[PDB]
Amino acid sequence: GAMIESSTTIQVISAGLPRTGTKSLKNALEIIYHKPCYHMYEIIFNKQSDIIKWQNLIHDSHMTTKTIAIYDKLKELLDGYIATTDLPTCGFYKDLMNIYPNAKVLLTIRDKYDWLHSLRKVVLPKSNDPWKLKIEEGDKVLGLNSDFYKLTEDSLKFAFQKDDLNFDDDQVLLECYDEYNRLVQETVPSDRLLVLRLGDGWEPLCKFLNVEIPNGIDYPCVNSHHQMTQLTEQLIKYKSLDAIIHMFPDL
Numbered sequence: 001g002a003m004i005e006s007s008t009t010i011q012v013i014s015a016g017l018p019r020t021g022t023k024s025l026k027n028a029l030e031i032i033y034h035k036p037c038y039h040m041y042e043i044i045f046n047k048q049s050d051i052i053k054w055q056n057l058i059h060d061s062h063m064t065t066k067t068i069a070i071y072d073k074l075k076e077l078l079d080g081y082i083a084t085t086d087l088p089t090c091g092f093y094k095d096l097m098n099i100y101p102n103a104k105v106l107l108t109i110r111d112k113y114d115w116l117h118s119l120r121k122v123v124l125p126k127s128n129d130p131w132k133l134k135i136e137e138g139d140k141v142l143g144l145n146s147d148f149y150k151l152t153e154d155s156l157k158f159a160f161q162k163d164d165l166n167f168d169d170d171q172v173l174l175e176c177y178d179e180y181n182r183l184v185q186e187t188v189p190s191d192r193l194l195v196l197r198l199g200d201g202w203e204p205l206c207k208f209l210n211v212e213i214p215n216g217i218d219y220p221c222v223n224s225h226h227q228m229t230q231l232t233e234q235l236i237k238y239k240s241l242d243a244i245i246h247m248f249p250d251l
């Protein structure tokens with residue numbers, strides 16, 4: 001159809017948790033809107049200076065006048081982006097809805113056991129898993145320290161609305177997953193919500209957003225734990241991102 005001039009502001013709020021296809025969705029939204037989408041990748045590879053701001057925001061966000069100060073920081077962080085996905089943003093979906101009243105909301109979901117397994121390989125390995133040491137070695141190469149891991153934990157706790165959380169307990173996480181997804185579908189008006197199951201592809205997304213399907217471009221399939229294992233190993237081998245970045249065309 002016709003080309004229209006789209007506003008550069010948050011148009012889509014994705015409430016889906018990490019390891020539910022948020023990076024493919026990030027890529028898909030950038031393909032559609034030709035402007036950046038927020039993601040943890042954005043923080044890691046472009047705005048590491050944002051880490052302390054999100055930490056500060058989450059610190060303050062257990063609390064009107066205080067709220068507008070929070071909302072204004074949210075707005076600042078997201079300036080120039082057309083959508084949000086993944087931690088740390090997904091836990092703020094209700095506030096993002098107030099701040100951007102004309103934004104639509106997405107929920108990415110998948111089989112809960114697949115989600116947990118993926119989360120253990122990439123985001124939250126058990127502390128006694130030898131792989132955790134490899135993840136940490138690789139993360140140092142990227143310039144990520146304990147503050148980054150703190151942001152991940154605090155933003156997970158914030159999304160799950162838990163004051164603390166036994167990260168090593170699979171049953172706890174599985175139940176938090178189910179409750180989170182459930183709560184989203186109860187909070188957001190069905191008029192304003194689309195639930196995307198992994199594998200659903202362009203069609204239901206583009207219909208929701210009133211856009212044509214990108215011509216000839218397949219719906220992204222990136223950020224598998226196998227690919228992330230390969231990246232970790234390469235990072236440890238070459239000791240830099242820029243030495244290997246050409247081998248991971250997604251980034």
Ligand SMILES: Nc1ncnc2c1ncn2[C@@H]1O[C@H](COP(=O)(O)O)[C@@H](OP(=O)(O)O)[C@H]1O
Nearest residue numbers: 018019020021022023024118220221223224225
């Ligand atoms: N188009 C697609 N179809 C099926 N699975 C997809 C997909 N895009 C991403 N995924 C899966 O979504 C997960 C990544 O999610 P996220 O980007 O939120 O971290 C990965 O799961 P696995 O680790 O099980 O392979 C990846 O395989």
Ligand SMILES: CC(C)NC[C@@H]1CCc2cc(CO)c([N+](=O)[O-])cc2N1
Nearest residue numbers: 018040086087123135138139152232
């Ligand atoms: C060793 C190296 C490969 N680590 C980099 C990866 C990149 C993907 C990723 C994604 C998330 C959430 O999307 C989190 N997270 O919020 O913890 C951590 C990481 N870490």
